[PDB]
Amino acid sequence: MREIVHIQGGQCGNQIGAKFWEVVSDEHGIDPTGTYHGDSDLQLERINVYFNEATGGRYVPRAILMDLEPGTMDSVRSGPYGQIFRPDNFVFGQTGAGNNWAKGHYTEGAELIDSVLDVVRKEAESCDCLQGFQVCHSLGGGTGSGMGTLLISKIREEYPDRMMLTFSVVPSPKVSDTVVEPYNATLSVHQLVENADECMVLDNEALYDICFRTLKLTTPTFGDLNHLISAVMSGITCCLRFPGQLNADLRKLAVNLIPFPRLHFFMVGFTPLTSRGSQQYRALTVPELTQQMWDAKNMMCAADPRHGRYLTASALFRGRMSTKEVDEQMLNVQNKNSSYFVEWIPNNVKSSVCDIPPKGLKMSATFIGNSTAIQEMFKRVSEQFTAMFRRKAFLHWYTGEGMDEMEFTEAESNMNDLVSEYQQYQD
Amino acid sequence: MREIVHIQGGQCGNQIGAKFWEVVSDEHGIDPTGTYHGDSDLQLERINVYFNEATGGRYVPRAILMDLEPGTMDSVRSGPYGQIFRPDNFVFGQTGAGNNWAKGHYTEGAELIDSVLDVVRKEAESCDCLQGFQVCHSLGGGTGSGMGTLLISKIREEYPDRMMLTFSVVPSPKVSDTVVEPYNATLSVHQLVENADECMVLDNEALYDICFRTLKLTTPTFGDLNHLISAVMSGITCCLRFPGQLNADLRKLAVNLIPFPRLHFFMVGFTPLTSRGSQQYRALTVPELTQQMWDAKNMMCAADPRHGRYLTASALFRGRMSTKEVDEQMLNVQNKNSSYFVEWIPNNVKSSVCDIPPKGLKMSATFIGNSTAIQEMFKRVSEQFTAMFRRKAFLHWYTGEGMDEMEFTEAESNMNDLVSEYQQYQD
Amino acid sequence: RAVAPPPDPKGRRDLFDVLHARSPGMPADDSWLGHQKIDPARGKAHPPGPEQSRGRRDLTELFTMNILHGDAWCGNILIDPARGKKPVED
Amino acid sequence: MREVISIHIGQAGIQVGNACWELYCLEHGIQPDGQMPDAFNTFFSETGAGKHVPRCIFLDLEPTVVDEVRTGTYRQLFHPEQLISGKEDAANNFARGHYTIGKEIVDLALDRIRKLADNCTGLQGFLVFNAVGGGTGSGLGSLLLERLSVDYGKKSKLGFTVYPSPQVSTAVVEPYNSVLSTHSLLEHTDVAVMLDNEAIYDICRRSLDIERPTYTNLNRLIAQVISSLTASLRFDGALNVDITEFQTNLVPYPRIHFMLSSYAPIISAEKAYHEQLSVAEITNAAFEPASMMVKCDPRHGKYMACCLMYRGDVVPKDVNASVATIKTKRTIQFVDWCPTGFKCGINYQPPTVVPGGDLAKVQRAVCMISNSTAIGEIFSRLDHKFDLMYAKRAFVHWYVGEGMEEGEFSEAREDLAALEKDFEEVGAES
Amino acid sequence: MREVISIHIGQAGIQVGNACWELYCLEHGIQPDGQMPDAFNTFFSETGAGKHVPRCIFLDLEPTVVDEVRTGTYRQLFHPEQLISGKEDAANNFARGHYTIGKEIVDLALDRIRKLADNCTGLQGFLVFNAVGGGTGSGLGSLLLERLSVDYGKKSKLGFTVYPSPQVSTAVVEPYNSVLSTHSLLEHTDVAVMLDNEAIYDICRRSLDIERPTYTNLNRLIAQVISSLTASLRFDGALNVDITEFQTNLVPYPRIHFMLSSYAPIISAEKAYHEQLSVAEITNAAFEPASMMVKCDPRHGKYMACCLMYRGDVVPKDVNASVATIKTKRTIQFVDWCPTGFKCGINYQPPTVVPGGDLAKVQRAVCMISNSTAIGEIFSRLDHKFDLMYAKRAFVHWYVGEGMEEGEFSEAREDLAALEKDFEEVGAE
Ligand SMILES: Nc1nc2c(ncn2[C@@H]2O[C@H](COP(=O)(O)OP(=O)(O)OP(=O)(O)O)[C@@H](O)[C@H]2O)c(=O)[nH]1
Ligand SMILES: Nc1nc2c(ncn2[C@@H]2O[C@H](COP(=O)(O)OP(=O)(O)OP(=O)(O)O)[C@@H](O)[C@H]2O)c(=O)[nH]1
Ligand SMILES: Nc1nc2c(ncn2[C@@H]2O[C@H](COP(=O)(O)OP(=O)(O)O)[C@@H](O)[C@H]2O)c(=O)[nH]1
Ligand SMILES: Nc1nc2c(ncn2[C@@H]2O[C@H](COP(=O)(O)OP(=O)(O)O)[C@@H](O)[C@H]2O)c(=O)[nH]1
Ligand SMILES: [Mg+2]
Ligand SMILES: [Mg+2]
């Protein structure tokens, strides 16, 4: 009865949650029509966390789909598992953000955010107890970045005692899908530090390397990329939807992983990723699950774990597992390379066990890492921002909606403050 | 709990290695699928020394495949027992050394050693207690010789207390398969005299002689070469994989065979070989192995043991054999040929009995010989290297990528230092 | 109007069979089995070869010693058995 | 709902539009009579029962090209009052197109966009087609963008415009009309795309392999460029881009909005079988100067921002790999203050081949729109020839007789003069 | 993947090429339209669905040879823009194809080379095919070899060059063109396989027993030789020898890279039935003094290094018996500083047979490439003829007018003279 209200924002946010509700319903056994077809009583024991019971056995998710372009709601509706959402929850506008953070936050945000909070407060007041809100967006765009951070700042004022689990697709170092990626990111991270309680940093270039090195996928589409992040999002809340030996819900990981309020960005990895060829060869045991857990390439963030020390890391083990290899392997990763861990925290790493595995897989685990090596990800975007800001490139569009030049300086000032704080504890 | 990590390098190593697990797996009763199908319970008792457990009852070889061409991995995988290896251990490059030793050691080897050290480090930590590493390669080539010898240097710095078992074939006296084989062998031998713990010297025309005289075969193919090596390679590890009355492991052979740290090049032969027509007429007993064991026509090295005295000897007898017949035949060859044995080591021969023979054979044995007659092989390569180096022929293909003539004089010096100390122990 | 997405070359739509353990596969049908830019299923074509062409000869039958439950030469290295004078009856 | 209004001024505008509306019927199955046997809302409005009328206007002072639409195969498709005609042509006089014989038609014009504005729900932009070489395309084009700015504010009027080539020109008075029309084009058009005839002549000769191309063969591949960038609004894709997406991502400065154009697989019928068209190969061929729509060398300048619109079976990884290959290459040089120089747009529907056309059926195509610093070399070319004729005061008595005074030419010269310093200032390192 | 770009320069280059691609399409089963009814990946590229285009360009300044390919049965096999034509030929002038005319085509050809270099995943080498008797093969060949060294540095390139014969010639100024083109071959070609037409004429006369051999009979066996050495890239064998292996085993010194060539089984249909093809005798026929494709006497010279490419059902032991028998033979000679002379290469696939060709089906084949001091006598005759015409300025005014001054002849004379001194010092004991 620890409910989570899910919000999807923007083109990327709608697509990542489209595969998210496809996976979590397949774990719980709901068909695309809406009925229940699972073979276990434990699947239906905790369905209140992500679904609302309706008349006739229908289950509706606690999902609010929001954007500004009606093309993506055509994409999620025409796609599979797209009929399960509430038609009243399809709140959005018609103007389109156009990858402008200022338009997504200031001009059309005034008319949009009034209607969306009515849908969100309807979902929150319906359930008896709230655990938090799970939002998903990107930081390179404007439809989910500016609009999402406007929503997150507004929803934390209304509900300050509930956690905010956000999923962000940050811009790539190697490539760039949008030209104004440093402008969108540095303003969005300036809003995420004080509103979001913790953030899980995602990016395509780490997912692309995983889809080619470990998974060995020939044609990784965005549907392929969406399943990797969505497999995490089921695994984070595994102790909520299922009973476990050592339960760890969304507030358990919050106090464990976060030393200071400004330091709440994580690098995330899903452990049992195998190719189709190497399914029979790899033996699913905990010690080989731990080495894939702590592999730098298996991290779904482009920041390299070898460059910086880990402050606190957590593991969400799933399956019928005994708890020495849960603990000794997390002890062994400390003594094998103690230089890569923060000295003033004894036993930086962390673990918990849920005895219900995912569908068809014996052992699984989800890794959350709060390391100081993510500073170069924020250092690079800040470096990319100051190059453009000095020449005032691509700014006459942003100042058109009503953003003065002072707010861009304040956003960059927080980036240098945040990147120095990570370097403060690295020394 | 004495595990062996196998590394196969180049055209020679992969083709030998492909036929090596042909003899290991069917002795343990493993199908090409990888499951278990044997009837004897003793086969299941010690499999972990060469295989790793996989989910579904599969047994996967503890082997690491390395090369510089994608040709041999296509050759190994296409053959029988070619799908047993992991897809992860098939690490190589696309360039190809082209028998250029410095290409495999300095330029085109640098980008791959860091990749092949990761799979060595992953495989060593998986097993609880290493017994030794087992590398099979050539000395006339440049891929298995150049990158192989850099791997010996890298694997000795990381693990300096574990045995090293190098199965290196040497350039021929009679014919030449590669034109630059004195250049590559002398540089490879200089990299083996310090780091390799024990080297088992093989030659192809010693294998050509036994298959045409003893086996009496009309058209012996290229797999005839590999099967005689594989019976030897499994013959060394007979006391590990199976019980026995007298046990002799890989370090046990090394201490009794090596009197001084640079005396670690061995000539090895295989005892129970016969032709088709001679099978019904021979009486396979303990003594008839010994007269064929010590005979130079059954030797598998280029050097003739009759020229130089035997420093130390070894005998790994397999089968339900009477120890007193292993006893009295061992002393019988010493007194019959007393000029062929070193005076200042009484009881040069070492013996061992394992009670489980190879599949289908009644009695078997393997002879490992350390003799001072092996200097004639090293003198031949050193003479052929000095003849080319004095006119600096074929040297721009070596000095063009980062080598000078200083270590060529050093490799010639360590070569002549090695053959001088063989000769003074002969006196 | 949702036009069809580009079809997969090997009929893979949602990677459920890849991420989950259902439908295990052969080591082929992957992107690479070497280091990179190598097709695993597409390698050098294999001719029948001399060992398979020249009868049944492999060394498993000679090593395993199954004869109890041919020779190239007998005596001198020159001649071969079963090739000699024509036997004459009466 | 998404919809764009296409406006075609002048004989160059109509002839591209004849090739354009030829193409738009093929992606939606519309017969020439107008009966489909619901992605057409960008260009077609469902009228009555089973009849679609294009969301366009064909306005021209010269009646000799608008009646060809009326007497042609597309008589029943277009609404008759939708097509606007005039008594007499501009005769390549900007003064006639802007002051004397232009005001009586533009009043009838603005009543026609207004009725298409009320019929449509949410407008995304206006697609305006004109050529600066003629008085109708320049004069009526300059008037029409000004009236749309004061009536429909902050709406992204995305323009395609034909410019004079250095080597080949079809009229003597082209430099006068080009400079005058550009001065109105800076302050009005949000996004303008550069088109030049002789580069497409080289494209038809080199890639498509046609010895004598015609104006019809030119506009057929031009309409492919229009359809490819607007295909994101019509059909869903992995990474969709709207009209508002282009202006906020390819315009670094409000006066630097002159983006180049390029197309990928411009490949004939027999050339398509032997060509191995891959995502990496078509991205490299996009940035070659041979595939450029404008005869200007991009190697002389720095790419400030470039946008790639992919259509067909494009996996998002291969376009992600093609971004890295171009930026690593030394020949393609970017400006120092824009590391994020690229934008990718992937659509799932391949381009539709016109039957009887010269282009072949191709799975994958890329429309390369780039904002560079090499456009100033084109505008330095037009500035030089404008000063040559203006020094002796040639072909000026035609213009000053028809309404204009002398002062408009000097102010248009100075306004265009500040553009090449602005392109030099934005290109210089700091 | 292993893959090589084979390019053909000049009239002799293209006529080798279509003779080569006649054999390549039959070897991989590719139909002439390009539709197959992974060994092809070395030479062909997979295109769309079931189309295989060669990784080959056909450049010549004279369009008379190129449009025969565009008209004949292989018109659908080649991509049209791979085939590069020119306006006027170099017309047996080195300077025309090197300075004046060839500069308008070498920019177009290297652009096409880069597109094939972009399409290929991992490049293995290049195969240039040119004749040094003509201006296009010499001049445009030298100009293109200049750009290949600076574009793709340290990358292997194979030079199959048809040198002038001592007696037979179809050209007059060919001592000028061969000397000037040789100066480019010293500095840029890593491995240059020598060829000569007269020795192939002798091979067809006495072995293939055809007394009227034309160019298509000569180029068919040349197609067998190039396919034999590259066959390890396409088919696996007992001892694979790829393109990179030839550099480090046949080139002792950086300025000695001219090698002879031999193909051992050269027999007719009726001759093949009576004869016995054995590995022991096929090596003797490979080293037979009349079996080479370059008019040299290796008894005059000394073998510095040898490479043997055995094809077919060759077991790995009679080949080593065959190598052992050659070294014991006192007629053949090997240099004193190289004891390990031979290199053995064994493949598993017999050579294909063209329908209507003179060759018959053979179970075994040997392609022999050797570096010898006997190739030094080719240049000695070439220097003797070149010094005669340059003694009193014959045929120089055609070379002076089109760019090249009189200084390049003195440099080419001196550099080839240093090549002669290079050959005699390495054979010294
Ligand atoms: N791409 C393309 N350009 C064209 C075509 N037809 C004409 N042009 C160009 O357009 C220029 C003139 O454009 P317009 O302003 O439309 O000419 P107009 O409408 O007849 O103007 P007036 O002659 O004054 O009546 C010419 O110089 C041509 O270069 C065409 O069919 N395709
Ligand atoms: N092996 C072989 N050699 C040929 C053949 N055809 C011509 N040649 C040789 O080519 C030489 C003539 O020079 P080429 O390079 O072919 O002349 P080209 O290619 O037409 O160049 P240009 O004359 O400048 O146009 C002659 O000496 C012949 O030995 C052929 O079919 N096979
Ligand atoms: N994983 C994933 N990422 C996506 C998808 N669609 C877009 N993206 C990412 O989103 C980024 C662009 O952000 P955008 O969609 O424009 O954000 P918006 O303005 O909120 O719509 C790109 O870097 C893409 O990698 C998707 O379906 N899956
Ligand atoms: N016994 C044995 N010797 C081999 C085998 N393959 C190659 N050789 C020997 O290795 C030498 C050539 O090795 P090479 O192919 O150059 O190895 P590379 O360095 O990996 O290229 C030859 O002299 C062969 O006799 C094999 O499978 N078994
Ligand atoms: Mg013991
Ligand atoms: Mg007109």
Short mmCIF file of N, CA and C in Angstrom, two decimals, chain B residues 22-23 70-74 77-78 83 87 90-94 212-221 223-224 227-228 231 270 273-280 282 358-361, chain C residues 25-28 30 32-46 50-52 54 56-75 77 80:
data_model
loop_
_atom_site.label_atom_id
_atom_site.label_comp_id
_atom_site.label_asym_id
_atom_site.label_seq_id
_atom_site.Cartn_x
_atom_site.Cartn_y
_atom_site.Cartn_z
N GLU B 22 39.59 -31.98 -27.98
CA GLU B 22 39.07 -33.21 -28.55
C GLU B 22 39.43 -34.41 -27.68
N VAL B 23 40.64 -34.41 -27.12
CA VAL B 23 41.09 -35.54 -26.32
C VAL B 23 40.69 -35.37 -24.85
N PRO B 70 41.26 -13.28 -38.06
CA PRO B 70 39.97 -13.97 -37.86
C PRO B 70 39.85 -15.28 -38.60
N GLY B 71 40.90 -15.74 -39.27
CA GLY B 71 40.82 -16.99 -40.00
C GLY B 71 40.75 -18.21 -39.10
N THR B 72 41.56 -18.24 -38.04
CA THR B 72 41.68 -19.44 -37.23
C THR B 72 40.48 -19.63 -36.31
N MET B 73 39.89 -18.54 -35.83
CA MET B 73 38.68 -18.66 -35.03
C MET B 73 37.53 -19.21 -35.86
N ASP B 74 37.50 -18.89 -37.15
CA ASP B 74 36.54 -19.52 -38.04
C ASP B 74 36.91 -20.98 -38.28
N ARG B 77 36.03 -22.85 -34.68
CA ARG B 77 34.60 -22.90 -34.39
C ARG B 77 33.84 -23.79 -35.38
N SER B 78 34.31 -23.87 -36.63
CA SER B 78 33.64 -24.70 -37.62
C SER B 78 33.87 -26.19 -37.38
N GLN B 83 31.95 -25.45 -30.58
CA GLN B 83 30.99 -24.58 -29.91
C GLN B 83 31.08 -24.67 -28.39
N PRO B 87 31.95 -17.57 -26.17
CA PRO B 87 32.15 -16.47 -27.12
C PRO B 87 32.95 -15.31 -26.54
N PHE B 90 36.99 -15.45 -27.11
CA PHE B 90 37.51 -15.33 -28.47
C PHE B 90 37.95 -13.88 -28.74
N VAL B 91 39.07 -13.51 -28.14
CA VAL B 91 39.62 -12.17 -28.27
C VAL B 91 40.85 -12.20 -29.16
N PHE B 92 40.86 -11.33 -30.18
CA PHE B 92 41.97 -11.23 -31.11
C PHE B 92 41.87 -9.88 -31.83
N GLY B 93 42.77 -9.68 -32.80
CA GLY B 93 42.78 -8.48 -33.61
C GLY B 93 42.58 -8.80 -35.08
N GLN B 94 42.39 -7.75 -35.87
CA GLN B 94 42.10 -7.89 -37.29
C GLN B 94 43.30 -7.61 -38.18
N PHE B 212 55.02 -41.65 -39.86
CA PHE B 212 55.31 -42.37 -41.09
C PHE B 212 56.10 -43.64 -40.86
N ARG B 213 56.82 -43.75 -39.74
CA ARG B 213 57.58 -44.95 -39.41
C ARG B 213 56.85 -45.85 -38.43
N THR B 214 56.40 -45.30 -37.30
CA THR B 214 55.71 -46.12 -36.31
C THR B 214 54.25 -46.35 -36.69
N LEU B 215 53.52 -45.28 -36.99
CA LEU B 215 52.10 -45.40 -37.30
C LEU B 215 51.85 -46.04 -38.66
N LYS B 216 52.77 -45.89 -39.60
CA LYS B 216 52.69 -46.48 -40.95
C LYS B 216 51.42 -46.03 -41.67
N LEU B 217 51.32 -44.73 -41.91
CA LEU B 217 50.16 -44.13 -42.54
C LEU B 217 50.52 -43.60 -43.92
N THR B 218 49.65 -43.86 -44.90
CA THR B 218 49.94 -43.46 -46.28
C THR B 218 49.91 -41.95 -46.43
N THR B 219 48.75 -41.34 -46.15
CA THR B 219 48.55 -39.90 -46.30
C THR B 219 48.12 -39.35 -44.95
N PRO B 220 49.06 -39.08 -44.05
CA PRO B 220 48.70 -38.49 -42.76
C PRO B 220 48.42 -37.01 -42.93
N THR B 221 47.29 -36.57 -42.41
CA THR B 221 46.83 -35.21 -42.65
C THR B 221 47.38 -34.28 -41.57
N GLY B 223 45.78 -33.04 -39.04
CA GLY B 223 45.29 -33.41 -37.73
C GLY B 223 46.07 -34.52 -37.06
N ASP B 224 46.83 -35.29 -37.85
CA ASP B 224 47.74 -36.28 -37.27
C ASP B 224 48.80 -35.59 -36.42
N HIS B 227 47.00 -34.55 -32.99
CA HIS B 227 46.53 -35.59 -32.07
C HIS B 227 47.68 -36.15 -31.24
N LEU B 228 48.88 -36.23 -31.82
CA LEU B 228 50.03 -36.68 -31.04
C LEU B 228 50.42 -35.67 -29.97
N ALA B 231 47.63 -36.04 -27.06
CA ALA B 231 47.86 -37.17 -26.16
C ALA B 231 48.96 -36.86 -25.16
N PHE B 270 55.73 -40.01 -26.36
CA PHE B 270 54.54 -40.77 -26.00
C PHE B 270 54.77 -42.25 -26.29
N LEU B 273 52.43 -46.29 -29.09
CA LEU B 273 52.08 -46.02 -30.48
C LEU B 273 52.44 -47.22 -31.34
N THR B 274 51.51 -47.61 -32.22
CA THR B 274 51.71 -48.77 -33.07
C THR B 274 50.89 -48.61 -34.34
N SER B 275 51.26 -49.38 -35.36
CA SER B 275 50.57 -49.39 -36.63
C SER B 275 49.40 -50.36 -36.60
N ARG B 276 48.58 -50.31 -37.66
CA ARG B 276 47.37 -51.13 -37.72
C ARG B 276 47.70 -52.62 -37.74
N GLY B 277 48.68 -53.02 -38.54
CA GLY B 277 48.99 -54.43 -38.66
C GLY B 277 49.74 -55.00 -37.47
N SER B 278 50.39 -54.15 -36.69
CA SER B 278 51.15 -54.58 -35.53
C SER B 278 50.33 -54.62 -34.26
N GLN B 279 49.03 -54.32 -34.33
CA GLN B 279 48.21 -54.23 -33.13
C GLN B 279 47.93 -55.61 -32.55
N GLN B 280 47.60 -56.58 -33.40
CA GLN B 280 47.24 -57.90 -32.90
C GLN B 280 48.45 -58.67 -32.41
N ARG B 282 51.48 -57.42 -31.03
CA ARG B 282 52.23 -56.94 -29.88
C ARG B 282 51.54 -57.36 -28.59
N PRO B 358 43.98 -43.66 -20.77
CA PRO B 358 43.15 -43.00 -21.79
C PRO B 358 42.10 -43.95 -22.34
N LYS B 359 41.14 -43.36 -23.05
CA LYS B 359 39.94 -44.08 -23.48
C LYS B 359 40.30 -45.15 -24.50
N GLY B 360 40.03 -46.41 -24.14
CA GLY B 360 40.22 -47.53 -25.02
C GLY B 360 41.59 -48.18 -24.96
N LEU B 361 42.58 -47.50 -24.40
CA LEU B 361 43.92 -48.06 -24.28
C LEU B 361 44.08 -48.73 -22.93
N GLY C 25 20.05 -19.62 -27.48
CA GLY C 25 20.47 -19.71 -28.86
C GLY C 25 21.90 -20.17 -29.00
N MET C 26 22.25 -20.51 -30.24
CA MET C 26 23.60 -20.91 -30.59
C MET C 26 24.53 -19.70 -30.51
N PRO C 27 25.85 -19.92 -30.38
CA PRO C 27 26.79 -18.79 -30.35
C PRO C 27 26.85 -17.96 -31.63
N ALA C 28 26.23 -18.41 -32.72
CA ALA C 28 26.06 -17.59 -33.91
C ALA C 28 24.87 -16.65 -33.70
N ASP C 30 24.81 -13.45 -33.71
CA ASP C 30 25.20 -12.32 -32.88
C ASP C 30 25.92 -11.29 -33.74
N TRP C 32 28.99 -9.79 -33.05
CA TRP C 32 30.41 -10.08 -33.15
C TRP C 32 30.77 -11.15 -32.14
N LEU C 33 31.67 -12.03 -32.54
CA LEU C 33 32.25 -13.02 -31.64
C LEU C 33 33.75 -12.83 -31.48
N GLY C 34 34.37 -12.00 -32.30
CA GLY C 34 35.78 -11.68 -32.16
C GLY C 34 36.00 -10.49 -31.24
N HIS C 35 36.55 -9.40 -31.77
CA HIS C 35 36.65 -8.18 -30.98
C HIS C 35 35.59 -7.16 -31.38
N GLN C 36 35.44 -6.91 -32.67
CA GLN C 36 34.52 -5.93 -33.24
C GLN C 36 34.59 -6.09 -34.76
N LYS C 37 33.48 -5.74 -35.42
CA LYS C 37 33.37 -5.69 -36.88
C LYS C 37 33.64 -7.05 -37.53
N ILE C 38 33.28 -8.13 -36.84
CA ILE C 38 33.43 -9.48 -37.36
C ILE C 38 32.07 -10.17 -37.29
N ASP C 39 31.62 -10.71 -38.42
CA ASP C 39 30.38 -11.47 -38.44
C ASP C 39 30.67 -12.89 -37.95
N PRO C 40 30.03 -13.34 -36.87
CA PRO C 40 30.31 -14.69 -36.35
C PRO C 40 29.86 -15.79 -37.29
N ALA C 41 28.65 -15.65 -37.83
CA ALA C 41 28.09 -16.69 -38.69
C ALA C 41 28.65 -16.66 -40.10
N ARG C 42 29.41 -15.63 -40.46
CA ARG C 42 29.87 -15.44 -41.83
C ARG C 42 31.40 -15.43 -41.82
N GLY C 43 32.00 -16.59 -42.10
CA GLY C 43 33.44 -16.73 -42.11
C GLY C 43 33.91 -17.40 -43.39
N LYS C 44 35.17 -17.85 -43.37
CA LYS C 44 35.75 -18.51 -44.53
C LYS C 44 35.01 -19.79 -44.88
N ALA C 45 34.76 -19.97 -46.18
CA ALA C 45 34.11 -21.19 -46.65
C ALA C 45 35.06 -22.38 -46.49
N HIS C 46 34.50 -23.51 -46.08
CA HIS C 46 35.31 -24.67 -45.73
C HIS C 46 35.19 -25.73 -46.82
N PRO C 50 41.46 -32.73 -47.25
CA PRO C 50 42.04 -34.04 -47.55
C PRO C 50 41.67 -35.12 -46.55
N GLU C 51 41.55 -34.78 -45.27
CA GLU C 51 41.24 -35.78 -44.25
C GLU C 51 39.85 -36.37 -44.44
N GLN C 52 38.87 -35.53 -44.78
CA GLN C 52 37.53 -36.04 -45.06
C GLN C 52 37.43 -36.62 -46.46
N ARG C 54 39.89 -38.23 -48.35
CA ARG C 54 40.59 -39.50 -48.50
C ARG C 54 40.06 -40.51 -47.48
N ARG C 56 37.93 -42.34 -44.51
CA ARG C 56 37.40 -42.13 -43.17
C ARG C 56 38.49 -41.79 -42.15
N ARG C 57 39.72 -41.55 -42.60
CA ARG C 57 40.89 -41.58 -41.73
C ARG C 57 40.88 -40.41 -40.75
N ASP C 58 40.70 -40.72 -39.48
CA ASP C 58 40.99 -39.83 -38.37
C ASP C 58 41.74 -40.63 -37.31
N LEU C 59 42.49 -39.93 -36.47
CA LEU C 59 43.37 -40.61 -35.53
C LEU C 59 42.66 -41.10 -34.28
N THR C 60 41.35 -40.86 -34.16
CA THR C 60 40.60 -41.37 -33.02
C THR C 60 40.55 -42.89 -33.02
N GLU C 61 40.37 -43.51 -34.19
CA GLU C 61 40.31 -44.96 -34.24
C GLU C 61 41.68 -45.60 -34.02
N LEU C 62 42.75 -44.92 -34.43
CA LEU C 62 44.09 -45.47 -34.21
C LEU C 62 44.53 -45.31 -32.76
N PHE C 63 44.18 -44.18 -32.14
CA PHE C 63 44.57 -43.96 -30.75
C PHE C 63 43.70 -44.76 -29.78
N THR C 64 42.40 -44.89 -30.08
CA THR C 64 41.47 -45.50 -29.14
C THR C 64 41.65 -47.01 -29.08
N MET C 65 42.30 -47.60 -30.09
CA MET C 65 42.60 -49.04 -30.16
C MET C 65 41.30 -49.86 -30.13
N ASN C 66 40.49 -49.67 -31.17
CA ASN C 66 39.24 -50.40 -31.32
C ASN C 66 39.36 -51.62 -32.21
N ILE C 67 40.55 -51.88 -32.76
CA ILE C 67 40.74 -52.99 -33.69
C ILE C 67 40.66 -54.33 -32.96
N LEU C 68 41.21 -54.39 -31.74
CA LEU C 68 41.22 -55.64 -30.99
C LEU C 68 39.81 -56.09 -30.62
N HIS C 69 38.94 -55.15 -30.25
CA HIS C 69 37.56 -55.49 -29.93
C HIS C 69 36.60 -54.83 -30.92
N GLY C 70 44.89 -48.61 -43.07
CA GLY C 70 45.79 -49.75 -43.22
C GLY C 70 47.25 -49.37 -43.14
N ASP C 71 48.12 -50.37 -43.19
CA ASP C 71 49.55 -50.13 -43.14
C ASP C 71 50.04 -49.51 -44.44
N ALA C 72 50.85 -48.45 -44.32
CA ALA C 72 51.42 -47.83 -45.50
C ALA C 72 52.49 -48.71 -46.13
N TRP C 73 53.38 -49.25 -45.31
CA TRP C 73 54.51 -50.03 -45.79
C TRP C 73 54.77 -51.17 -44.83
N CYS C 74 55.29 -52.27 -45.38
CA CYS C 74 55.69 -53.42 -44.60
C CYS C 74 57.13 -53.74 -44.93
N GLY C 75 57.97 -53.79 -43.90
CA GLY C 75 59.38 -54.05 -44.12
C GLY C 75 60.14 -52.86 -44.66
N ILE C 77 60.67 -49.38 -46.70
CA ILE C 77 59.84 -48.19 -46.81
C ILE C 77 59.24 -48.05 -48.21
N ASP C 80 54.34 -51.40 -50.51
CA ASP C 80 53.12 -51.39 -49.73
C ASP C 80 52.50 -52.78 -49.75
#
